[PDB]
Design a protein around this motif. Structure first.
Motif, PDB file in Angstrom:
ATOM      1  N   UNK B  11      41.642  35.611  34.668  1.00  0.00           N
ATOM      2  CA  UNK B  11      41.966  35.061  35.975  1.00  0.00           C
ATOM      3  C   UNK B  11      41.482  36.021  37.048  1.00  0.00           C
ATOM      4  N   UNK B  12      41.123  35.462  38.201  1.00  0.00           N
ATOM      5  CA  UNK B  12      40.636  36.235  39.335  1.00  0.00           C
ATOM      6  C   UNK B  12      41.364  35.792  40.594  1.00  0.00           C
ATOM      7  N   UNK B  13      41.796  36.758  41.397  1.00  0.00           N
ATOM      8  CA  UNK B  13      42.486  36.500  42.648  1.00  0.00           C
ATOM      9  C   UNK B  13      41.889  37.358  43.751  1.00  0.00           C
ATOM     10  N   UNK B  14      41.954  36.903  45.006  1.00  0.00           N
ATOM     11  CA  UNK B  14      41.385  37.701  46.100  1.00  0.00           C
ATOM     12  C   UNK B  14      42.337  38.772  46.609  1.00  0.00           C
ATOM     13  N   UNK B  15      43.007  39.464  45.693  1.00  0.00           N
ATOM     14  CA  UNK B  15      43.921  40.545  46.036  1.00  0.00           C
ATOM     15  C   UNK B  15      44.473  41.118  44.741  1.00  0.00           C
TER      16      UNK B  15
ATOM     17  N   UNK D  65      36.460  51.238  35.171  1.00  0.00           N
ATOM     18  CA  UNK D  65      35.846  49.916  35.138  1.00  0.00           C
ATOM     19  C   UNK D  65      36.834  48.861  34.660  1.00  0.00           C
ATOM     20  N   UNK D  66      37.430  49.060  33.487  1.00  0.00           N
ATOM     21  CA  UNK D  66      38.513  48.216  32.988  1.00  0.00           C
ATOM     22  C   UNK D  66      39.670  49.132  32.616  1.00  0.00           C
ATOM     23  N   UNK D  67      40.772  49.021  33.347  1.00  0.00           N
ATOM     24  CA  UNK D  67      41.924  49.902  33.158  1.00  0.00           C
ATOM     25  C   UNK D  67      43.165  49.038  32.990  1.00  0.00           C
ATOM     26  N   UNK D  69      46.419  47.122  33.725  1.00  0.00           N
ATOM     27  CA  UNK D  69      46.713  46.512  35.017  1.00  0.00           C
ATOM     28  C   UNK D  69      47.824  47.240  35.763  1.00  0.00           C
ATOM     29  N   UNK D 141      52.012  38.481  31.212  1.00  0.00           N
ATOM     30  CA  UNK D 141      51.027  37.421  31.040  1.00  0.00           C
ATOM     31  C   UNK D 141      51.655  36.041  31.183  1.00  0.00           C
TER      32      UNK D 141
ATOM     33  N   UNK E  41      42.610  45.156  34.180  1.00  0.00           N
ATOM     34  CA  UNK E  41      42.215  44.609  35.471  1.00  0.00           C
ATOM     35  C   UNK E  41      40.940  45.311  35.916  1.00  0.00           C
ATOM     36  N   UNK E  42      40.131  44.604  36.702  1.00  0.00           N
ATOM     37  CA  UNK E  42      38.873  45.148  37.188  1.00  0.00           C
ATOM     38  C   UNK E  42      38.554  44.546  38.548  1.00  0.00           C
ATOM     39  N   UNK E  43      37.930  45.352  39.404  1.00  0.00           N
ATOM     40  CA  UNK E  43      37.433  44.883  40.689  1.00  0.00           C
ATOM     41  C   UNK E  43      36.020  44.344  40.504  1.00  0.00           C
ATOM     42  N   UNK E  53      38.753  41.653  48.786  1.00  0.00           N
ATOM     43  CA  UNK E  53      38.551  42.220  47.462  1.00  0.00           C
ATOM     44  C   UNK E  53      38.972  41.211  46.404  1.00  0.00           C
ATOM     45  N   UNK E  54      38.218  41.161  45.309  1.00  0.00           N
ATOM     46  CA  UNK E  54      38.496  40.270  44.191  1.00  0.00           C
ATOM     47  C   UNK E  54      38.782  41.102  42.950  1.00  0.00           C
ATOM     48  N   UNK E  55      39.887  40.798  42.279  1.00  0.00           N
ATOM     49  CA  UNK E  55      40.285  41.475  41.053  1.00  0.00           C
ATOM     50  C   UNK E  55      40.384  40.458  39.927  1.00  0.00           C
ATOM     51  N   UNK E  56      39.935  40.852  38.737  1.00  0.00           N
ATOM     52  CA  UNK E  56      39.927  39.984  37.567  1.00  0.00           C
ATOM     53  C   UNK E  56      40.807  40.586  36.482  1.00  0.00           C
ATOM     54  N   UNK E  57      41.708  39.773  35.938  1.00  0.00           N
ATOM     55  CA  UNK E  57      42.607  40.175  34.866  1.00  0.00           C
ATOM     56  C   UNK E  57      42.130  39.557  33.560  1.00  0.00           C
TER      57      UNK E  57
END
Ligand SMILES: [K+]
Ligand SMILES: [Mg+2]
Lengths: 50, 60, 228, 221, 159, 95
Positions: B11-15, D65-67, D69, D141, E41-43, E53-57
């Motif tokens: 999932x992607x969110x703008x924050x 890069x991937x950490x 959350x 999740x 999580x990643x930017x 800013x966009x973050x992806x889980x």
């Protein structure tokens, strides 16, 4: 070749989609190809008949 | 038209969202009354049952 | 502002910045930064976080006026399996915190954890006039503890645990110290395993709750116990 | 509540930033002055290096890069004396206290309300209670899955609405159908892995997308 | 089936067997770390005009790679799945098609449903009208042959 | 004050069965409706013979190279399309 930029020897510019519409431009391109074929038949008949 | 496939894996969110902090606060306002009503209805999903229409006080 | 230069700076390689930053930090004197050189080298292998535990003020009276002295404790640790506590005293709160923060890097220690997220077994520790209890929980369950212990768990990397503290908890230095000592009383399955003559194998067994919890929720325990 | 906090410009407030507000609407047009105010949270000056660095550069310096959350919080809001605050005396480094949690926890709950479309707090509280009973081992999740299962957020993902607020208005007008007919309890139900969503206001949605991308469309067909 | 050009082989389950001790006197499983991964999580993006800013889980970010390819298959691939299913449903089962194109079974069935709906629109005369009419193709299942890249390099052969 | 007519919906399959029964039967076979015992219809399955696809992207968006591989794909599609048109024309040319 003298017509370096006019590679396709066109007489009129293509219609602008932003002004005349995408569908209108596509129809115009199809009509242009048919006119070229029709003109070819038109010149041959006149030469053969006269 | 769109179709869902399965529980999300990304999932992607703008924050940036800190879920642990959000849930830590919400764990302070939990109601035992509402939770118990949900538990009872999980065991009575089927309308076509004899045991689903017994005598009880309240809604469930 | 120049957007083109802003974009260029944002999408750039940081190797040059890393080299310059590392050289400057490692060349500083031991007075401004009393961290040993060996510790400074390791600081570039992890990500660090810090938090203030408590600040106390002491007053000494004299013939004419009073002398004020401040003491503070700061906890720092890398996200996974590193934690340290430092104490510092100064004539002002700001100076005391700074000294405590620097002293924490000289007290780093290793924290044993089962799979890096919980404890091996139940722990009960009695620091002077304080009692702390630690109970393991299944992965993903979450943390149930006070705000102070929540911050400490983030530093060490503990993810699932339940902590209960009671007694004379007025002094927060003792509470943090008791929590630190409890984590160091765990035992691991691989301690002196060569002298056992067996294979100590990890197994999967779901934990149970008490009978009262089952009755209130209207649920049943594992079938292995209900067999009749 | 005709407040400024209910407008997109001032919707989100974060007390841990140099500029307390935060921008979360990807289609909001800002003025030059407003952009300058927000940019202060992106650029910072380093004394020893004598350069400006960005938030993205800070992540690269930390090799992130991937950490996990939960670890991103320590990167966005904190500073280090060996990577990004080299040259500053330790006496002037900012270290947080255990008394700042309440402001942070309240802020995050406000974020969930904003993402769902300015929902009430009781709406979020029941959503959290709902997940507690559903099967799954990771609580974090499960909360994320619940957000995705909401109908209005799913409509936004399709790409037919500018933001969640516009999607909600579409549902009230019955511009999107569920399994061939308008949805029942559309504001309270959750979508399942086999649900089908379709647009009933085809002429309206097509006009919306064409106008949005009219300027970015090429002039050659 | 080489890791260089097979992302699927790279993203494969791992068989973990780690020990501490002496195999001749006594051993114990190594349970000091978690080798199965965790939520990450990643930017991903930063808009410089709006400061967004966009973050992806990702649920399994530490044990997967290039997961964005699954949902971005080309239109050519989707049509190929639709044609193979129609040609021979007996051999081209949902399991076979999923394995062939390195996707999940749910995605395979969902793709077929959407293509079937589109075909009805074309046949009914609601799409591909006017100048774009020539791009609506009717294909007989018998008159279809699938080529293979058997010869090394460029070139597709019938068998 | 809305002039928009009230919308009462129906499932896509429900409408299709009343408009074109042949298309509905074909979709059932394609969508794997005969594999599950519970959902298996009583009527026997029908064989699939003809399908329709859209090739706009494959012709003008996806294959730009000048190599023989890309040229062959476009030529085969164009040739097949002409055959389909000719078959339709032959059905009407005779007096
Ligand atoms: K509210
Ligand atoms: Mg207590």
């Amino acid at each position: 070749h003298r017509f370096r930029n006019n590679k396709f020897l066109r007489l009129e510019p293509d219609l602008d989609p932003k002004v005349y519409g995408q569908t209108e431009t596509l129809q115009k391109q199809v009509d242009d190809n048919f006119s070229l074929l029709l003109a070819k038949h038109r010149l041959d008949m006149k030469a053969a008949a006269a | 038209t769109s179709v869902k496939l399965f529980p999300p894996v990304d999932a992607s969110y703008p924050t940036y969202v800190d879920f642990e902090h959000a849930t830590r606060l919400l764990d302070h306002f939990t109601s035992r009354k509402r939770l118990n009503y949900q538990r009872k209805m999980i065991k009575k999903r089927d309308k076509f049952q004899i045991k689903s229409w017994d005598h009880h006080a309240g809604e469930a | 502002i120049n957007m083109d230069q802003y974009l260029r700076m944002d999408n750039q390689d940081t190797l040059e910045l890393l080299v310059q930053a590392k050289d400057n930090f490692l060349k500083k004197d031991e007075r401004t930064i009393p961290i040993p050189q060996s510790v400074r080298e390791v600081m570039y292998r992890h990500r660090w976080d810090k938090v203030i535990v408590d600040v106390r003020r002491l007053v000494y009276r004299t013939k004419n006026n009073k002398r004020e002295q401040y003491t503070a404790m700061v906890a720092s640790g890398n996200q996974k399996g590193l934690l340290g506590l430092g104490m510092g005293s100064a004539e002002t709160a700001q100076l005391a915190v700074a000294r405590a923060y620097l002293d924490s890097f000289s007290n780093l220690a290793a924290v044993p954890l089962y799979r890096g997220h919980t404890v091996y077994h139940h722990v009960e520790h009695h620091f002077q006039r304080v009692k702390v209890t630690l109970s393991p929980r299944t992965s993903g369950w979450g943390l149930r503890c006070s705000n102070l212990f929540y911050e400490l768990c983030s530093l060490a990397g503990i993810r699932d645990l339940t902590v209960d503290v009671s007694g004379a908890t007025r002094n927060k230095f003792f509470v943090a110290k008791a929590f630190f000592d409890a984590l160091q009383k765990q035992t691991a399955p691989h301690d002196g395993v060569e002298g056992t003559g067996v294979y100590v194998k990890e197994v999967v067994r779901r934990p149970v709750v008490n009978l009262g919890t089952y009755r209130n929720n209207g649920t049943l325990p594992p079938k292995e116990y209900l067999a009749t | 509540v005709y407040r400024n906090s209910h407008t997109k410009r001032f919707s989100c407030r974060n007390s841990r930033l140099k500029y307390p507000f935060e921008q979360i609407w990807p289609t909001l047009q800002l003025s030059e002055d407003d952009a300058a105010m927000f940019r202060r949270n992106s650029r910072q000056f380093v004394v020893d290096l004598s350069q400006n660095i960005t938030l993205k550069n800070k992540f690269a310096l930390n090799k992130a890069t991937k950490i996990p959350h939960q670890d991103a919080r320590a990167l966005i809001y904190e500073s280090n004396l060996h990577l990004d605050a080299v040259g500053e005396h330790p006496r002037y480094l900012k270290i947080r206290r255990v008394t700042s949690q309440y402001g942070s926890k309240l802020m995050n709950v406000r974020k969930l309300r904003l993402l769902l479309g300015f929902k009430r707090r009781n709406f979020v509280q029941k959503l959290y209670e709902h997940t507690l009973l559903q099967q799954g081992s990771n609580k974090s999740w499960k909360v994320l899955c619940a957000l995705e299962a909401k109908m209005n957020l799913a409509v936004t993902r399709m790409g037919v609405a500018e933001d969640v607020l516009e999607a909600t208005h579409d549902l009230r007008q019955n511009n999107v159908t569920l399994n061939g007919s308008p949805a029942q309890m559309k504001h309270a139900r959750y979508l399942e892995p086999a649900d089908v969503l379709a647009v009933s206001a085809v002429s309206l949605i097509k006009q919306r997308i064409c106008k949005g991308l009219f300027e970015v469309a090429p002039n050659t067909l | 089936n080489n890791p260089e050009d097979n992302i699927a082989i790279r993203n494969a389950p791992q068989k973990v067997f780690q020990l501490i001790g002496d195999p001749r006197s006594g051993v114990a499983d190594d349970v000091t770390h978690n080798p199965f991964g965790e939520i990450t999580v990643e930017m991903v993006w930063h808009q410089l005009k709006n400061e967004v800013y966009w973050y992806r889980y990702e649920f399994a970010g530490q044990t997967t790679e290039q997961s964005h390819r699954d949902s971005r298959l080309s239109d050519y691939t989707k049509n190929l799945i639709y044609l193979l299913r129609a040609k021979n449903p007996r051999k081209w089962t949902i399991e076979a098609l999923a394995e062939k194109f390195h996707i999940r079974k749910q995605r395979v069935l969902a793709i077929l449903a959407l293509k079937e709906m589109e075909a009805h629109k074309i046949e009914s005369g609601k799409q591909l009208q006017g100048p774009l009419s020539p791009y609506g193709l009717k294909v007989r299942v018998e008159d279809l042959k699938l080529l293979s890249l058997d010869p090394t390099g460029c070139g597709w052969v019938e068998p | 004050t809305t002039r928009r007519r009230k919308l009462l919906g129906s499932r896509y399959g429900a409408r299709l069965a009343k408009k074109n029964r042949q298309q509905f039967e074909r979709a059932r076979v394609i969508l794997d409706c005969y594999s599950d015992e519970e959902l298996r219809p009583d009527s026997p399955p029908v064989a699939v013979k003809e399908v329709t696809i859209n090739t706009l992207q494959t012709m003008r968006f996806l294959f730009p190279q000048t190599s023989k591989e890309h040229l062959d794909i476009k030529q085969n599609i164009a040739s097949y399309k002409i055959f389909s048109l000719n078959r339709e024309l032959l059905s009407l040319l005779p007096k």
